[PDB]
Amino acid sequence: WGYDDKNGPEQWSKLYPIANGNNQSPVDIKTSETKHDTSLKPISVSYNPATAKEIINVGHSFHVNFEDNDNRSVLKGGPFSDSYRLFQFHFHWGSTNEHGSEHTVDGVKYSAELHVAHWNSAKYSSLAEAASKADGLAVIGVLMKVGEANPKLQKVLDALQAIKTKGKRAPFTNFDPSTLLPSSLDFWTYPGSLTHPPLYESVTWIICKESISVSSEQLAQFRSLLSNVEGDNAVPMQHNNRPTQPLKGRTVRASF
């Protein structure tokens, strides 16, 4: 699977029939249809910079992984009763500044999106066990609006020169990715899925109301990553955003 026409979003259902499921992500958040939910608690993130582990070029994207052997780095509150353990963050982006985000808000497409990924360590003993469970996963999504350069992205962007081609991996240490979140943690939540194969319906989504900035040149750094292995012809990683999927009756709740 990929983001090519031959192996892309429109094709994923042939190998992963859940692609046409009732809980697929991402979605268009229509603000006139969201329901304020008084019981939603504030989002609580408490991440230990010593849990940052490595940065890896996975062909379609790059991932920053965290040590997830214990509860040093956790998400709590919002819609959750259980503690969720941080394991990764990554980005999605588009061929153009005009699109790139996965979620949209009242039909508006942002330039990129940050995903901070967690698994339910209260209920399950590993990411692999949690990944297919309705309550297994949690993602904080942040819409990225093209404008001013975002100095908080710097350590990440500086690291990409060491993982230029597919399969390249490097240490990535001493980083707290709560530094990337917006100052307001007002949020939408809905029950959803992984936005790429295997597309499991295992994700409680937390979408921040407030965007963060990114420059057109910072986005160019992401698109300059290469999907090919070292020594082959260069194939820039131009896009990795899935189109929005039908709500199929789900309710998007607002903390605000």
Ligand SMILES: C=CCN1CCC[C@H]1CNC(=O)c1cc(S(N)(=O)=O)cc(OC)c1OC
């Ligand atoms: C089940 C596949 C395991 N993969 C390899 C190791 C991490 C993972 C790669 N990334 C994802 O598949 C992945 C992607 C998202 S996303 N883009 O936010 O829907 C979320 C996630 O866990 C909340 C993910 O991990 C389960």
Ligand SMILES: [Zn+2]
């Ligand atoms: Zn993602």
